[model samples]
Target chain A: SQIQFTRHASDVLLNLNRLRSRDILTDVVIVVSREQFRAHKTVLMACSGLFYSIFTDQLKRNLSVINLDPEINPEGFNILLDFMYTSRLNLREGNIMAVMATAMYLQMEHVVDTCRKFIKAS
Target chain B: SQIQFTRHASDVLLNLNRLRSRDILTDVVIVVSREQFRAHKTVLMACSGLFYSIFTDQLKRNLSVINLDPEINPEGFNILLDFMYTSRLNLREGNIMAVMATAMYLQMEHVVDTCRKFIKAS
Candidate 1:
């Protein structure tokens, strides 16, 4: 028989966040401005085309510390990074522009899509 | 207000499976009997408590190759590994026992929980 457990994916993400919070086995660090975000490369690769390309394109391979574009806002990136771990895109009029630029730069399409919808509604 | 921006498990699972298929950044290899499964450590840690403890407890720290029980059923493990990546638990009565043994061995609480239910009525 076939049993579909819908919570599996979200549960994985939840535990991933747990791992991140506890600073366990974080293989990659993304630096934006003066900020450094510790995270798992596999999650970044699986979640974003930008990360997948960066990770596997031989450009960032074997590099533990990744420096992001200087212009990318660390504020929005913090939100975006948390969203990656938690799957909650926190978008607001206050931070929408910042998040847009960050998501666009990161090429996280889901965040871009969500930011687009949030901005277009008003 | 609220925008869920829900990500379907199948879509996320697709990318993870792709990563495995391409062997991109697969940090760990599981050897069961004579069989080997290439996978990401972060995924394993996120999906299985046994992996989380094994990873954090200094017992198997940073070991790229992990050898499972010599008596492990390779075919059953193949199914369990697929479920880990794809989030689909296929528990056929024919292979249910096999999967049960593998899942129990791995100490995947979710799979063990599901396996118990699967054998009961559904």
Candidate 2:
């Protein structure tokens, strides 16, 4: 039982993404930068409060395509998607600040908190 | 921006168990102490390395029921089940030792490590 919660979430996220890529039981299709990514509604709702409010309140219809922010960097959104599922962020020189900015905008607390800790650690 | 990994995992675990209880794509039925609990094989495999090996090598079939250690304490197993899913253990004074023992037998390193930390904190 020496499992790191972040690591476990990371692995689970990878598996879920694998399934979604194979078109297995995907409920929501998030479109970003002309690329479409599939995800589960429950998973997205559970991870992001902003997504929850947006999906449940603003977009009541079961619409297929969700284009939230056109200005949002595709890579940053991808990293946020990974963080939403796994709770782990692979911070790099290129993408850390972009991801942090995206996560802050999305109100993903865990990712923000983890990133703060990461900075303090370094 | 303060979200606990354990708490998030715990919430995810509860949702998963709820789906399993509703018979939404359950892959394995674990029988313990005259009671049955449903779980996803992939989830179990990802959480526990012991379970990974057990399902992969020893039991090749899509065997429905797994009868493991009839003498195993039900509540302890329940706590362990919650721990397996959420990575958070609400260890009371009563079931601490039992869970510790079960976790030891199951080779759940995360649980053991957390328990040790819990004791040290107290």
Candidate 3:
């Protein structure tokens, strides 16, 4: 007998939601503009090499808050938060540059590629 | 020239977060276990026939809290909420029946089907 594993779009959505909800666990807090959002440490570390290095290397102090750089616009961070939690962003007319910078800093390659594609189309 | 409408998993995740966050809009409240969850009326009505009829019918008393059925297990409903927002459920060995009942009440056909498939496999 042959068996196969098939995954649908909804399953992907569900896993992302599980990460966003932190239903079972959480280990990190991201602070921006003094507002804090809690998330799974593994998720942050898994998604970007930038986060992995920060969490594994210097921040080995096991601190909770990441306290993102002040230069990172709060609004842009929210947009990036959307990308991180859901892996999607509404890259449209006005908010492109800010999102690009956020994506670049976070080292999220796919988002950066999407931004580049949109820029090229324009 | 060619045009295509391409939808991605990330896009679906993003829309779900937008709804969950109520970032731009909201209209209804779902009350469970004495906790209130705010949501958009349009999204609810569009997604489920039960909600559609409830909101559009006499309950047009212009209410905020839906105050779900007292018997609805809060844990199951939370799982259902995950299905609604992310369209996915981790239907393991233990939670199948409860989730199936919740999906039936909510008129989420896909979830019901998924539950059936899991049962058949067992």
Candidate 4:
């Protein structure tokens, strides 16, 4: 008999987010201004072009520690990083512009998609 | 400032589903016909009234090992149990009635909510 756990992808995404929550199996830290955010390179490289650039060998190894200080607003990047782990967006009209700007800097299209939809609605 | 990981409810539900996946931290096994399914009592009790009844010691421990054979429809119950852990519904016209019947037996109002909408749409 073939054992199948198909339709298990949704659960897998949820699982990876769980691993991140426990701060276990994580491989990278995103230094945003004064605060530091922890994450998994496996997830980041898979989800982000900006992240993929650094996760590759030699080239990025030289310039690893990402420091998005004044360029990336802490609150906005914080929400974006969390959303990168979990697909749900935590955005509002009040902080919409901040996330939009932060997303632009990070090159995350998904957040921009939500930002566009949220702005269009509100 | 207060350590706030609030809005973490979604992630908690996701984490419970993760625990069930690794077959780690699960507290119950659902015996449905020929197949046995592993699950967490914490999740089942919280999600299903049918489950809550059987988890509060004495009354339920007296009649624990749930054996829902034939009447539960193994495939349908399997889907429902997985949905109980992760809040996604996996029902189609081909098996909608199967899950609806299973949900009725389990008294899970949410599955019925989805079933009604799925039926109304189809």
Worst 10 residues of 2 chain B by lDDT: B1-10
Fnat, one value per model:
0.53, 0.09, 0.09, 0.00
Docking class of 2: incorrect
- TM-scores of chain A, one for each prediction: 0.93, 0.75, 0.79, 0.83
Question: Which segments of model 4 are wrong by more than 4 Å?
Answer: A1-122, B1-7, B62-64
- Across B1-122, the per-residue lDDT of candidate 2 in tens digits comes to 42335555445555665555555555678888888878766566656656656765544536667786977777877787766666556687677778777777667787777777766866
Model 2 Cα displacement at B64 (Å)? 1.8
Taking the candidates in order, what DockQ does each have? 0.59, 0.11, 0.07, 0.03
lDDT of 3 by residue, A41-117 (tens): 54465455567568656435266778888787667777766555554576766888888888788887777888898
- Tens-digit lDDT track of model 1 for A1-122: 46677888878778778888988888888999999999988778777778988888876777899999999999998988887777677788899999998889888887787788888895
- Clashing pairs in model 1, backbone N/Cα/C closer than 3 A: none
Query: Per-residue lDDT for B1-122 in model 3, tens only?
Result: 11211344435444544535743234567887666677655445534556756765654625666888777666676776655555456577787888788778877676788789989998
Worst 10 residues of 4 chain A by lDDT: A1-10
Off by over 4 Å in 1: B8-10
How high is the CA lDDT of each candidate model?
Answer: 0.82, 0.66, 0.62, 0.66
Q: What TM-score goes with each of the models?
A: 0.93, 0.51, 0.47, 0.47
CAPRI-style class, candidate 1: medium
Evaluate model 2 with DockQ and give the value. 0.11
Candidate 3 or 1, higher TM-score:
1
